[PDB]
Amino acid sequence: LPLDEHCERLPYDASKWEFPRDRLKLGKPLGRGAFGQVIEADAFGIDKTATCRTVAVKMLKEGATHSEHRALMSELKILIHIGHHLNVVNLLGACTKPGGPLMVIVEFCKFGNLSTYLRSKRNEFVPYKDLYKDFLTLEHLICYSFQVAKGMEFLASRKCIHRDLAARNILLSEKNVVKICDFGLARDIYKDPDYVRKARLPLKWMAPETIFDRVYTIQSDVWSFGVLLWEIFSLGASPYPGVKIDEEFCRRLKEGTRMRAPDYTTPEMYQTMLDCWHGEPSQRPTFSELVEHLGNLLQANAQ
Numbered sequence: 001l002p003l004d005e006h007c008e009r010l011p012y013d014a015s016k017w018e019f020p021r022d023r024l025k026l027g028k029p030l031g032r033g034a035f036g037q038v039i040e041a042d043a044f045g046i047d048k049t050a051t052c053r054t055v056a057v058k059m060l061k062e063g064a065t066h067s068e069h070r071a072l073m074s075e076l077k078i079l080i081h082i083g084h085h086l087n088v089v090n091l092l093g094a095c096t097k098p099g100g101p102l103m104v105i106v107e108f109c110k111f112g113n114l115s116t117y118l119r120s121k122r123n124e125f126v127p128y129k130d131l132y133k134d135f136l137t138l139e140h141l142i143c144y145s146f147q148v149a150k151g152m153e154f155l156a157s158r159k160c161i162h163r164d165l166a167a168r169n170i171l172l173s174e175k176n177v178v179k180i181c182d183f184g185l186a187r188d189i190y191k192d193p194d195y196v197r198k199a200r201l202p203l204k205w206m207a208p209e210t211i212f213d214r215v216y217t218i219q220s221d222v223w224s225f226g227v228l229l230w231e232i233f234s235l236g237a238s239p240y241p242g243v244k245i246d247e248e249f250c251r252r253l254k255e256g257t258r259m260r261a262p263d264y265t266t267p268e269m270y271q272t273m274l275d276c277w278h279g280e281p282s283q284r285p286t287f288s289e290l291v292e293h294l295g296n297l298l299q300a301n302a303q
């Protein structure tokens with residue numbers, strides 16, 4: 001059975017993952033939706049003996065019901081199944097004992113979501129480079145792209161699909177490391193511009209077969225990855241500039257309409273975007289192929 005569609009059968013080994021709520025000092029919110037939220041916190045010795053560590057805690061909030069409670073437990077189970085990889089949100093522990101809220105504790109990614117971050121660095125970017133000390137460069141952008149591909153290749157190896165891949169679901173940590181994540185309930189899709197009534201769906205990131213056939217596969221994730229690449233090389237711009245996301249937009253996508261090259265892209269990266277947007281899912285590159293390709297482009301950029 002699907003590892004992420006039938007996660008209720010997955011194990012939750014409390015002896016390994018349970019963390020005492022009294023060793024968690026909850027702080028300010030990092031993101032909030034209608035029923036869920038992520039809060040910054042200080043965990044004592046969650047990953048290193050007697051060491052304070054800033055972490056992110058995903059949990060529910062006022063408005064949530066038992067259904068969201070069950071959903072959060074499934075999220076915990078799937079994160080345990082997926083396991084650890086440098087480019088995937090890293091689960092550190094959980095608080096599941098009665099008397100308090102269910103809390104999923106993950107590694108804190110200092111810079112938050114990549115979409116917001118990149119959009120904030122427009123005045124701190126140079127293709128190639130003390131004055132530019134903290135400037136982003138093409139190397140950074142290609143590296144982020146490469147890392148997300150690595151994370152998705154890993155996710156695929158765990159027999160899971162993302163279903164909402166986008167820059168808003170990529171976190172940036174220290175040392176230029178990015179991690180794939182899924183805010184889920186910690187974002188209110190019914191109030192977010194990126195989700196449209198079609199049922200709130202991220203239409204601008206969805207492959208044709210997902211929009212018209214409701215089909216979700218790792219190859220539809222590849223299409224989304226292409227849109228993510230566009231977001232990266234546009235430094236956080238919103239996809240399909242000035243385009244009304246309606247029935248006509250979907251029809252045109254089917255026909256072959258694609259976004260033009262973003263301002264900061266290289267010719268190779270734009271071609272990669274177009275490849276990810278092939279109408280036929282089987283003709284789109286696989287994440288393993290993207291890892292190879294992007295790794296080569298990253299190396300080439302250093303030349």
Ligand SMILES: Cn1ccc2ncnc(Oc3ccc(NC(=O)Nc4cccc(C(F)(F)F)c4)c(F)c3)c21
Nearest residue numbers: 030031038056058089107108109112180181182183
């Ligand atoms: C908002 N925010 C700012 C800094 C920060 N650092 C870590 N996590 C954050 O928020 C989180 C985002 C998502 C999750 N959860 C999550 O990513 N679950 C999930 C569920 C199924 C699949 C996957 C994926 F790995 F496939 F993406 C992730 C989380 F706990 C905290 C942070």
